[PDB]
Design a protein around this ligand. Structure first.
Ligand code: HEM
Length: 390
């Protein structure tokens, strides 16, 4: 029957399957859920799908439609950012994730210094994921949300199930969802709560927002923490791994730290942290390249193939931190559903790389690359541990 998608959980190299997709930039695949989908792999056609309102994100959660994998979340939260905007909270949300809000940029530089010094004090080797990228990501999201740093562990423990890419519903996902919601409701009335959750609590009783239940405000906190932490931890872990795989680039940034912002664009382009496709349901019959896509069919945007399309990025496998169009990568999506937290994502990664170059310039892998354990059937490619020495 059909070519199975996805291809490999290994994040050390592009799956070999990508090369054969170049002759068939729209190809029918069988998904994890066992459903047909169109896998789109050229930069031009991926951009077209992301920018065209005939390709719906919201409709991928409708009942009975072809799926990539099973939902771990209630259906209505697939269009989270739209339910957020619709409810009048967009302003509060966009403020909390702005890296210029309440000294957030200064806090990230300061806290990254603390986490790396704690690692330096213990000596090598350490698991960089467990001891740096996890807490750096989780603590950022505790600060944004206004909840205690000490609660990061209970909320992060959910994400190993929440972002699974499973053929079947997961009983653990519903139990974790209900527990994290109940926790976030408790934070609304907690006198200690600050940040986004304190601003969301304050809207209650404001006549305009009588439609906003405690569960609905709690949904904003839970989904922001989950999406934000898995994305920042996933990307940053694999951006550092890419710098370990390209020591010449690590060395360019040691001598030229002013190039770090541009280097993060080029790492967004080549990193292999995305293990799935960006899903869209066709609202209408659309010709996409050579393929007549039918109304109600599932389309998957393959970011890692788009970002290495030589038509758009000549010499695509070269990591060039001076690449003029590095910024045109699809790793933050595009069109109506473009990541709203790109300023924070970039700044978070820039600062971590800056602090590691300054305080741990001899950073290297502590194990043979083949001894990494790649997480299977998960939305991200990540090594369970990233053992490093210096
Ligand atoms: C740091 C690296 C990050 C990466 C690589 C990343 C990547 C992405 C991508 C690819 C999408 C588009 C999904 C699609 O088109 O179907 C997206 C959307 C989104 N991201 Fe990010 N993201 C990052 C950080 C964050 C953070 C820190 C937050 C914090 C709250 C966040 C919240 C969201 C939300 C709510 C959406 C949905 C947008 C919508 O439906 O309009 N992201 N992200």
């Amino acid at each position: 029957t059909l070519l199975d998608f996805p291809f490999s959980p290994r994040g050390d190299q592009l799956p070999p399957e990508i090369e054969a997709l170049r002759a068939e930039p729209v190809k029918r695949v069988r998904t994890i859920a066992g459903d047909p989908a169109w896998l789109v792999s050229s930069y031009a056609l991926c951009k077209q799908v992301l920018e065209d309102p005939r390709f719906s994100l919201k409709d991928t959660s409708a009942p009975g439609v072809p799926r990539q994998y099973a939902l771990t979340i209630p259906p209505e939260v697939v269009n989270n950012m739209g339910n957020i905007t619709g409810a009048g909270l967009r302003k509060a949300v966009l403020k909390a994730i702005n890296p210029k809000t309440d000294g957030l940029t200064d806090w990230m530089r300061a806290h990254a210094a603390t986490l790396v010094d704690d690692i330096l004090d213990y000596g090598p080797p350490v698991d960089l994921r467990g001891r740096f990228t996890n807490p750096y990501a989780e603590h950022l999201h505790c600060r944004i949300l206004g909840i205690p740093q000490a609660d990061a562990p209970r909320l992060a423990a959910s994400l190993d199930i929440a972002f699974m890419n499973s053929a079947c519903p997961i009983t653990g996902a519903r139990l974790n969802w209900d527990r994290d919601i109940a926790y976030m409701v408790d934070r609304l009335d907690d006198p200690a709560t600050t940040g986004l959750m304190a601003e969301l609590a304050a809207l209650r009783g404001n006549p305009d927002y009588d439609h906003l239940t405690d569960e609905m405000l709690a949904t904003v906190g839970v989904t922001m923490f989950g999406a934000g932490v898995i994305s920042t931890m996933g990307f940053l872990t694999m951006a550092i791994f890419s710098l370990i795989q390209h020591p010449d680039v690590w060395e360019q940034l040691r001598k030229a730290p002013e190039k770090i912002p541009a280097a993060v664009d080029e790492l967004l382009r080549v990193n292999l942290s995305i293990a799935d496709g960006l899903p869209r349901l066709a609202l209408e019959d659309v010709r996409l390249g050579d393929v007549e896509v039918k109304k109600g069919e599932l389309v998957l945007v393959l970011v890692e193939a788009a970002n290495t399309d030589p038509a758009m990025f000549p010499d695509p496998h070269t990591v060039d931190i001076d690449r003029a169009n590095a910024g045109a990568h699809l790793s933050f999506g595009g069109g109506a559903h473009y990541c709203p937290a790109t300023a924070l994502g970039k700044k978070h990664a820039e600062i971590a790389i800056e602090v590691l170059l300054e305080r741990m310039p001899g950073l290297r892998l502590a194990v043979p690359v083949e001894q990494l354990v790649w997480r299977t059937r998960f939305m991200k490619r990540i090594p369970e541990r990233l053992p490093i020495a210096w």
